[PDB]
């Protein structure tokens, strides 16, 4: 006669840390599939997208200081940046300051290209070497 689903959600909202639960109360599995203090907040997702616009690609030491004040691993940044540009080789883009407007354009151009090329795996274009 008690519903634990609702109970969890209500409890979760008051008690649960921000990243644990969603604004509706339920718990977000993104958090729990990322170890420890390694989960990637949507709020520092815009921070990577903001740093590529200001400092450019591969500027991670440059961009690490500004938007990820101390630590996010620079491996992570270059790995998410190939998420932003829809490509698995980000070599082509290095050192270029890219606007959020452009990044979005590059992403939809590399993805449509890789789908015609049939070189798209996991919404990321596979670039030949």
């Amino acid at each position: 006669p008690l519903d634990f689903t609702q109970y969890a959600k209500n409890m979760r909202k008051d008690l649960s840390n921000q990243d644990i639960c969603l604004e509706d109360g339920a718990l977000n599995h993104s958090y729990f599939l990322t170890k420890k203090g390694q989960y990637w907040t949507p709020l520092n997702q815009k921070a990577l997208q903001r740093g590529i616009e200001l400092f450019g690609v591969g500027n991670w030491k440059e961009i690490n200081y500004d938007e990820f004040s101390g630590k996010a691993n620079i491996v992570e940044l270059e790995l998410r940046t190939c998420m932003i540009l829809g490509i698995n080789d980000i070599t082509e883009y290095y050192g270029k300051k890219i606007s959020e407007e452009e990044q979005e354009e590059i992403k939809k151009s590399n993805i449509a290209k890789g789908k015609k090329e049939n070189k798209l795996k996991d919404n990321i274009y596979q670039k030949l070497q």
Binding site: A8, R12, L27, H29, Y31, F32, C82, K121
Partner: protein
């Protein structure tokens, strides 16, 4: 070794797993975590237990039927006094408490629950199957088990808690230790099913449906 091309091959292969996992996550990949657990990541020294008391009273009529503990005894090194000082008394009013006592702290643990007003009644024994024995270096006797001390306060006369349901002895493997047997939560189910539970110093492995879980590594 001809291994420059090797290393370039592991990198492009490894990134695609990241590009795979993050997409499945974006597409609603579920967690192992069951959907009805209530994880809380705090420091029991820095945590305010009135918030947990208000919220539980609020969305539930009740207070906790069961409390589980695995203190970080210092031998993550929490001061002994500090653990004793947690306001457990206020967290639960009628029911049972479980707390895992390493051999070093078995007597201290008994003092501790008695301090918090429980009456020691039972102890769970967990032997560690090779898969069928356990070799641990005791000072006086080798250790083949750790033990769960069980105290009780209030009216359990209620049908809410069911007597004579469960075992003393648990036989699980030493999974992933330091990690307790799952069939603890099976036993707690038998002892009292569909109840409000609490675990202190819990870890992500611990999280189960209906359980409020507090641990600094959540």
């Amino acid at each position: 070794q001809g291994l420059l091309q090797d290393i370039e091959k592991r990198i492009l292969h490894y990134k695609q797993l990241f590009f795979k996992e993050q997409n499945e996550i974006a597409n609603g990949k579920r967690s192992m975590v069951p959907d009805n657990s209530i994880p809380i990541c705090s420091d029991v020294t820095k945590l305010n237990f009135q918030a947990l008391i208000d919220a539980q009273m609020r969305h539930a009529g009740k207070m906790f039927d069961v409390i589980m503990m695995d203190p970080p005894w210092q031998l993550d090194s929490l001061s002994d006094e500090k653990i004793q000082n947690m306001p457990i008394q206020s967290l639960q009013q009628d029911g049972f408490i479980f707390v895992w006592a390493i051999n070093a702290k078995y007597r201290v643990t008994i003092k501790m629950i008695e301090n918090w007003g429980y009456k020691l009644v039972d102890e769970i024994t967990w032997v560690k199957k090779t898969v069928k024995i356990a070799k641990g270096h005791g000072f006086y006797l080798q250790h083949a088990k750790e033990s769960c001390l069980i105290g009780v306060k209030g009216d359990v006369d209620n049908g809410r808690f069911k007597k004579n349901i469960a075992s003393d002895v648990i036989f699980s493997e030493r999974r992933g230790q330091s990690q307790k047997p799952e069939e603890i939560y099976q036993y707690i189910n038998q002892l009292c099913p569909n109840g409000n539970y609490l675990e202190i110093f819990a870890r992500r492995n611990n999280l189960h449906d209906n359980w409020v879980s507090i641990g600094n590594e959540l």
